């Protein structure tokens, strides 16, 4: 059978500076044949591809801050930042690379606490607002090629019956 | 010294279609890496497509592409390939490249990705016997409701972005 990742909580709701914990479970044992626990931390952020943080559990990969730290065995891991920065938040995906099929969790949204109105905004430094402003632009062209995807779509079936007469 | 990882070939396709997806490396010995291909579905799940040893010897598929995907690559090109054939619906995603570091992890860098959307299996029934003034008129209408939705999209995230300016001007 197919390992299943299952991660938790859905969603993490955080203030900078914060500390963050999330969890990931798998369906069974995922010790790789040749010993090693192929379990790997990704980041991804809107519109954007994954980023590697951490893979065989513990380790950091390259250019990761401290802040960031993976532990586990068995069945029970777990990701945890320190001190949470602007530049963390997005969807952490925990991924199993030792039993074929390889597969995925289904994901974790690290969030802001941003109230009922935009007062959070305001504790933030200029920098970090400038990398939120940015970070738009990717999820906006994303959203626009799905719509342009969409169009192709509904115009190929009058293509082919305008070409079929 | 500059990693690079370009995917290229997506698009549109039928049920049962087909598409070749490229992916052109550079900034690192391509040939010393196997390589694979990882989906993002529509619903933000990620599924490992495909993966492929740094010589070609080896190949990898779950079973959910075997038999109808095949990964490819040209290390004298610095090119990665998926062959996807007998395409099905679930298979509408964004497609990325990504290199691995063999024994260590499995997904080291990352391209930005390159779109297939597999297309409905009907719409077509309707559309046949209809005149060509009205397929023809039905092709015009459709760019302006696109443009619209496009539009429409650059008026929601320029609603996203004001508070964000708001607080940069209140500094």
């Known amino acids: 059978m197919d390992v299943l990742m299952t991660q938790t909580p859905l969603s993490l709701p955080v203030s900078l500076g914060d500390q963050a914990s999330i969890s990931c479970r798998s369906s069974?044992?995922?010790?790789?044949?040749?010993?090693?626990?192929?379990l790997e931390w990704y980041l991804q952020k809107p519109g954007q591809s994954p980023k590697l943080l951490i893979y065989?559990?513990?380790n950091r990969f390259s250019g990761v801050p401290d802040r960031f730290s993976g532990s586990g065995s068995g069945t029970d891991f777990t990701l945890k930042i320190s001190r949470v920065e602007a530049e963390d938040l997005g969807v952490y995906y925990c991924?199993?690379?030792?039993?074929?099929?390889?597969?995925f969790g289904g994901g974790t949204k690290l969030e802001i606490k941003r109230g009922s109105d935009y007062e959070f905004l305001k504790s933030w430094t200029v920098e970090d607002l400038q990398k939120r402003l940015l970070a738009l632009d990717p999820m906006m062209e994303q959203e626009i090629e799905e719509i342009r995807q969409k169009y192709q779509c509904k115009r190929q079936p009058i293509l082919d019956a305008i070409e079929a007469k | 010294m500059e990693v690079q990882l370009v995917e290229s070939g997506g698009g549109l396709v039928k049920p049962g279609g087909s598409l070749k997806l490229s992916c052109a490396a550079s900034?690192?010995?391509?040939?010393?890496?196997?390589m694979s291909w990882v989906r993002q579905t529509p619903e933000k799940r990620l599924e490992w497509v495909a993966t492929?040893?740094?010589?070609?010897?080896?190949?990898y598929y779950p079973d959910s592409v075997k038999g109808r995907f095949t990964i490819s690559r040209d290390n004298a090109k610095n090119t990665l390939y998926l062959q996807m054939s007998s395409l099905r619906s679930e298979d509408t995603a964004m497609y990325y490249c990504?290199?691995?570091?063999?024994?260590?992890?499995?997904?080291?860098?990352w391209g930005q990705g390159t779109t297939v959307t597999v297309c409905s299996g009907s719409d077509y029934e309707f559309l046949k016997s209809w005149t060509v003034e009205d397929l023809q008129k039905r092709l015009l209408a459709l760019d302006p409701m696109m443009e619209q939705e496009i539009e429409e999209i650059r008026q929601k995230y320029q609603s996203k972005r004001q508070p964000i300016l708001d607080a940069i001007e209140a500094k």
């Open positions: 991924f199993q690379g030792s039993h074929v099929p390889w597969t």
């Open positions: 492929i040893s740094s010589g070609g010897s080896y190949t």
């Open positions: 990504a290199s691995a570091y063999d024994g260590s992890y499995y997904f080291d860098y």
């Open positions: 900034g690192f010995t391509f040939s010393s890496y196997a």
């Open positions: 069974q044992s995922i010790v790789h044949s040749n010993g090693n626990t192929y």
């Open positions: 065989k559990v513990s």
